[PDB]
Amino acid sequence: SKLKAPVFTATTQGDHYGEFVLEPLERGFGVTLGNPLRRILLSSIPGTAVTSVYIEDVLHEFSTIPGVKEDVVEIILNLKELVVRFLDPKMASTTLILRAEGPKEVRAGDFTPSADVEIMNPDLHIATLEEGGKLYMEVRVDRGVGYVPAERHGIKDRINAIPVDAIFSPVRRVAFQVEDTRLGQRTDLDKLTLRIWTDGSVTPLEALNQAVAILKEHLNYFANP
Amino acid sequence: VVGPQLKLHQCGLPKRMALELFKPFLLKKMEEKAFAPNVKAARRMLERQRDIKDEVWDALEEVIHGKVVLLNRAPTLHRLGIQAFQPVLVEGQSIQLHPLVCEAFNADFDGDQMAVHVPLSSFAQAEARIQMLSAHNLLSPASGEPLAKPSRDIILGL
Amino acid sequence: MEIKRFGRIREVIPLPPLTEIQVESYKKALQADVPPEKRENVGIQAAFKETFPIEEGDKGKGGLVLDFLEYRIGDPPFSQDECREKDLTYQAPLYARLQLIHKDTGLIKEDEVFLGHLPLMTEDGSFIINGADRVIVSQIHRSPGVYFTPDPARPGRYIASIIPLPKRGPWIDLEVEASGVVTMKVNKRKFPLVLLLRVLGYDQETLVRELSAYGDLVQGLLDEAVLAMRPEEAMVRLFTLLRPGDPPKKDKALAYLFGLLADPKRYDLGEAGRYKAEEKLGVGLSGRTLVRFEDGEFKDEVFLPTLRYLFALTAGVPGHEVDDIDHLGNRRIRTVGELMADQFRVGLARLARGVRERMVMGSPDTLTPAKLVNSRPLEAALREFFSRSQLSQFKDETNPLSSLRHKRRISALGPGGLTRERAGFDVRDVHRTHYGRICPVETPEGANIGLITSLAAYARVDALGFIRTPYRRVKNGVVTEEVVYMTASEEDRYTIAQANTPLEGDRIATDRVVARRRGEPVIVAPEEVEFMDVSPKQVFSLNTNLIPFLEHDDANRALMGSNMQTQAVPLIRAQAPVVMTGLEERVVRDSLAALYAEEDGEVVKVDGTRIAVRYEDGRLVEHPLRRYARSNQGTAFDQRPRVRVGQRVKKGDLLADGPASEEGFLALGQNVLVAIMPFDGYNFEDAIVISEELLKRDFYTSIHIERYEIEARDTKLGPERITRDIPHLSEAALRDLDEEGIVRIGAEVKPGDILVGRTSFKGEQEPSPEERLLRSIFGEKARDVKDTSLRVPPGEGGIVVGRLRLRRGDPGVELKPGVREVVRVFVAQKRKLQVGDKLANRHGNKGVVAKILPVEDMPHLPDGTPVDVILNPLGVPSRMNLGQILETHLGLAGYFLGQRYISPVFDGATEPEIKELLAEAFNLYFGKRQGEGFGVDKREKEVLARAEKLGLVSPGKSPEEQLKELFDLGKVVLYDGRTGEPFEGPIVVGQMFIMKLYHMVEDKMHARSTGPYSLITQQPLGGKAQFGGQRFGEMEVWALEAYGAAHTLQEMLTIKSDDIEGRNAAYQAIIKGEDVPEPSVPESFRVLVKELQALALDVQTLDEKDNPVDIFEG
Amino acid sequence: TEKVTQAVFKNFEENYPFNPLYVMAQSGARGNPQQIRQLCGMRGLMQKPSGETFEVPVRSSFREGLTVLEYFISSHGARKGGADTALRTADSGYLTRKLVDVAHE
Amino acid sequence: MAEPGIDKLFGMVDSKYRLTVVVAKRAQQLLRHRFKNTVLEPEERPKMRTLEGLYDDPNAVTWAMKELLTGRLFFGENLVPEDRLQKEMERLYPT
Amino acid sequence: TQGLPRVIELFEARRPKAKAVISEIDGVVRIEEGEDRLSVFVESEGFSKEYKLPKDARLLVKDGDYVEAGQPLTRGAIDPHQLLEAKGPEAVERYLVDEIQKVYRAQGVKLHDKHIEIVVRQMLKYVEVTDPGDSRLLEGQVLEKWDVEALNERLIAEGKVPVAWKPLLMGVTKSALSTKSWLSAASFQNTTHVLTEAAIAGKKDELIGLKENVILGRLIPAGTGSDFVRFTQVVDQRTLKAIEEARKE
Amino acid sequence: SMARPVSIGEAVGVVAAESIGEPGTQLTMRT
């Protein structure tokens, strides 16, 4: 049978991205763990994302917001680049709010002061209004798993709001690759490197741990009832 | 044999042939690294018919670290008919060749062979790794064009 | 597996006996089963007649004649095997019933004589010579006749060639110079033709009468008024001119040679010389370039009338054309029989001079045959052939086909009558004519391209060395059953219809009949057609005929797969390919590597050793299986029984299989589950990816057998002796040696292991005392004998499978002077596919296994089955071997449909048929998946989707209905082993027959650090313990000069070769972790300087201050 | 033929831009238009050993079975190439050597 | 993974071969004194991965190139005579 | 002719088949007579030079055309020796390079001209003496080593004879053949001639080229074995100041 | 072929010979 328990190095940046290198794995096991984790990693980690927007004055994503230097589209996208942490562990829905000045440029940390909900990336360039500029926003945030386009859910908070594509998944990129390493005479033993990029929110390492737990959990369903 | 795995500056080298190619160097290393009281006794345990002890592979490996070899195919027609590489300790008995280096060697994986050589003196190493390392000779000396271009399969993917 | 047969054209004639060339040639040169009264010329029979009313010195004064009456072929003194064991040539003594007469009369027929030993051909077609099976390849030369030709050194002019049968006359060329003069060139001597013409009695005025007013050409041939003379005097002058020295009037003597009689110019008894010299030239002939004893003066018969056509081509009315030297109506075939017989000529030729020599030395009263004949000029002339002629190859024994194909080879090189390896390009090209006779495909890729070739399946060499192809006479509408083999020339006058052509019942069916005539492809009216191709198989070689979809393979890659099959080593689980062509059973049959019944009887006994059958009444024979014997190329010929105890045998059917044979059919490899897709760079360029699965299933694995040999010779120092008593050797090193010195059988032998112990004497010094004093005091008995045993060389090793011993003395055994006893050790070795090995397919898709994957990887069908080998598509388009693609498709049918296939060449499967079978297959394959409880999982649906975006499936069809769509186009939804996720977009998958070739990484791959330096050249060369040492060629010297690599080049030039001082300093430094060099002075330099001094010449070496240096200090 | 050849190439373009044979030929990958022609379209006008062209063309294309006479007519070429390469591979580094003996210094 | 920092190394010198010659000539001394000769010491020294922790890379030339790359060594084309060059060389723990 | 045979024809300065005539003189063209006999005159004021053609010849100057010193009359290839004398050494160099490339180009190959140039110049390395100053009047001499006399005896030690010479198109082989250093010269077709000669004269090598030093096993005079680089020493911070404190002793 | 000016000591002669030489193959010999 043979081959000792491998060593698991982790090297991290501290919010987004960390490398994970469990070393001598027998020929094959590299992928055998690597890929399923990636699947789980990109697919089934719980997060939160903007899911619907209401803009005071104007329906349609394809409209004209006046006084706004940008336009609805860049906002929707801008919004998708926003991350918010739900401190309140029971809640599964929140609405955010915005009130906009004249000559000013709105950051994401210019939202509704609201406690209980934690804006993770206070910067972020949301919008920008001109002299005599008016923007009010009602942005819905939702708990979730993958990437869920609007054309699926169709969240309608109002009868005027436009619904956005949901990227509720703190992992933004998973890239893994198994190369060969050597123990003694054996030069072709698996060495799997896991590279996890998450939005500063859930750490890569946490991501990984969660991901493992999901697969293990699931693997216990293969218990005869 | 094709070695897609390697980086541009790396090599085949079956363990057997590395070991031997490099033998004398290993003998001094074996001594340097304990097991092997003298270099003459290092010679000895490398002979006992077959079956090689892990420590020695580990030694060999250290021996090699950053030395390069010369590979060479068939009709050596221009300088790129020799290229330097860092040897990788590899399974099996075929030498493994980076796919990007093929063109210059006009190597084709249907029965080609290549010889390999070990530059001994530090000069000759230096010589190989500065001047003849596969990865410092990226462009044709005949028409200053890239010779290490993506190709026959890499293109397809891209 | 049930077999499905393909295509129409019902094969009117089966392939002829194949080794026919060889086997039937000999027969008719050795009428050994025909009474010595009949024996109508040719062969040995004629070669005697050609020599044997042999006179002695003087013309009708001194007695003694000695006349051949009949020869007798002896009987083999050693069985076909003893020979191969004792190291002898399978022979039979040859006897001549000769008869010597006198002037006082006395008809003495000395009861035959032994003139020498005649090597006998086997059933095979092959010979046995000093052990070892040799094959005599049939050569080709110019079919004798008269030719002309253009003149390469003078444009708008011509030469004239009078070329007789080989070793039956001299080469006479006629050519006109810028002088006008016509000049005869014979035996590389050149005189004015006129001189001869004068001899043959032409007169200044007869010539102009005959040879004037076309061209002012005669005017040159004339002017030699000086020798437009007395035909007798002409003769004298011409004899002085041909043999400088002896000046008498018996010039009739030599001039009779290049004239009349069957001594020399016998351009035929009355065949392809006279015949073709008549049609081209001015008709009416006998058989010799001129006739002599008309009454005592020569009479011209070919010289002038040739000259006619020569002049009549230097201006000449139409009809007086040049000649196509490359036409097969101008190319003849010397088969074995004739070459062997031609060699008798050399033999008997010599034997005669040395009779006439002994007729002069001896008293005529007592001289007898036996006392005149020597028995050694026939031997040495005919030993020399079978042993030392280029035409006598070893015997390509890799697999049955390779051997079989050897015998049917044809080469324009060889002895004398043969072009060198530096001439002929017009020759090389596949000339029109080759059709049906020689192959447009088989030739070796470089150097001797076209200078060697394959005889075609249906071709037959004939009567006088012309290859003849079968045709079907079509009596103006109906295709008759009568088959007419006919010449390359006897073809240029007909309109022959192709076989691809349709038919109704027994007659042509279409209105626009395709056919050729002379050479041009021609469209022709049905009634306007005369003959018909018997098959397309006519056109190609045996091997070229084995490619199931040749029609679809570009002819270059076809030739690669035609050879390459000949490299295909036999396998333990060897298996006949999934998609065959027909000859695969027969190839194995005519090779006689497989054992077949003699006369429908009943098998009694069956074991790994023998098959013994009781043939209906006709006694009982035991057929011994050759078992793990070693082919010339180290391959392992071994028969396996294919028949059970107490079974009735089919007439002449497989009792046993050969080395590359599966139940009687050809098995050059394995058919195996393939997928044509890129892997991860692992099938880059030509590399193949393998599934380990194949090793677990011991598929591509084969048994190779080395052969080691050692001699013991006598020596000025004492005898080389084969002991097991080898000095100093630990009784553990000797462990595997029987009490003789020779390894046990079944012994497992690693490199450096005594295979055959042997002590030699050697006198390398004398031990001066003290050492002799020391020797006793501490025990070990000073020995007179060095070790020098056999031993396994680095790289090699395996199981000892047989020994062989031959002792000087022993009955039939004859080793060379000095050699006294010889030992032979045979060592087997199971092999197994390996990264570095090369697999090929029938369509020339060669390549090396570059990665074995464990089944966890490997693309796999949905049912779970993994593929076996992953072949890269990028390989296909550039070479245009599309047959491999089709083959994968039919194969994919097979897998599911459970059948193999016979698809003839240009007559096999069509897509219509192939896709019908793929249809039937998917219906069972998917019928299972449904009937088992499934259907079209998400993975296939995600593919099938983008599959229509790819216009590859019909939109508006069900995923099931869309799956079939694809399965029929021959592709399938593969699944990535590494990650269950499906390969996006369908992959063509199926069974492809793939061969393992002669080459393997095992035999290659060598690496040296140091060791054995030659004492002669002082550079590393050979290796008893450690091996090898690679050459640094002048090309590499350049590269290093091209790079700036000064020291690296200098390294390769000193310390790793001759430079004793240097290497030693270097290796003593590497051992001690020092930097290495500071090489004092290139040894090369010293050497040259001294090697110069030895020849006088100072060679001063000087520094920049121009004073001397002394690169030596000692 | 140039009509078939051009046609077989604008078919890929207009339907089948992701067809392998094409994709490969199009990209640097493998194949040139000369080869796609013989594969898909029509092989064309073969020349005889004495240079002169046959006035019957090879009407078929590997995909479709090309036919013994076509195969034979088109086998002359598939020898003239093999002989050509065996001459420019014969002499090892003939010219290079000449060029080095002058240049080297 | 081409030679580490070689673009910088080629630019340091006039004729590239000079580069080799320096690397060599340095990897020379750097060997003939057990590396008690480095200029780079602190935590600059190149190192090796193992079945074991980071050990001093044993490649002279590899060290030589890292060394050079720090401007801490000098190329005398003719500065300091060869007679005096082997003099003070065998001094700071040579044997 | 095409292909490699051409490239040799060229690199070896070889007077080809179908030399396709060039006019030796400037002047005006005049084609005369058809089928019977075909000749072409390029007659200027004064001289009337006549150039008889094969008759089959596909000439490429039509009647009346004005013509140039060495201009092709007929088509075909051009003799590089006829070109030398008619129109100098540069025009030669420029023909050779541009023709050699005419083939690599025509085929598929792309290489830089300089390579071919480097080689071509060597084909022009030597010149034969006409009326000397020191040596015998006929000898072939290296272009440079004649300047070692021409611009030597017309400066410091000025006078005698400037040594007149002639341009000498050497084929690649011939030029390789006449190569000063005997060591190199030895490796060619007749080693004896070389040594015999070079022994009589106290001949010395000097070993400039490479073919030389590889023969001896010496370190090639190039790359790292280039005099311009191999003397380069590396001194090391503390080694330099400590070497400075034993210099003033 | 590093697209800079030459280094002193480039063995340019041989480099040329090789450059002109290596293609010597893929030229057709029919003349």
Ligand SMILES: C/C(=C\[C@H](C)CCCCC(=O)O)[C@@H]1O[C@@H]2C=C[C@@H]1OC(=O)\C=C/C=C\C=C\[C@H]1O[C@@H]3C[C@H]1O[C@@H](/C=C/C[C@H]1O[C@H](C[C@H](O)[C@H]1C)[C@@H](O)[C@@H](O)/C=C/CC/C=C/C2)[C@@H]3C
């Ligand atoms: C080149 C040559 C013979 C070579 C040794 C073999 C041919 C090489 C071509 C090739 O394989 O590509 C010539 O051959 C003959 C006459 C003069 C020439 O002599 C020659 O130029 C040179 C040698 C001629 C005869 C040598 C005879 C002896 O030399 C050794 C022991 C004797 O037999 C030789 C065995 C040759 C058999 C070969 O068989 C081939 C494969 C290998 O090349 C060999 C196994 C098979 O593919 C087989 O089908 C090919 C047969 C070639 C038929 C040619 C016949 C004419 C072996 C190499």
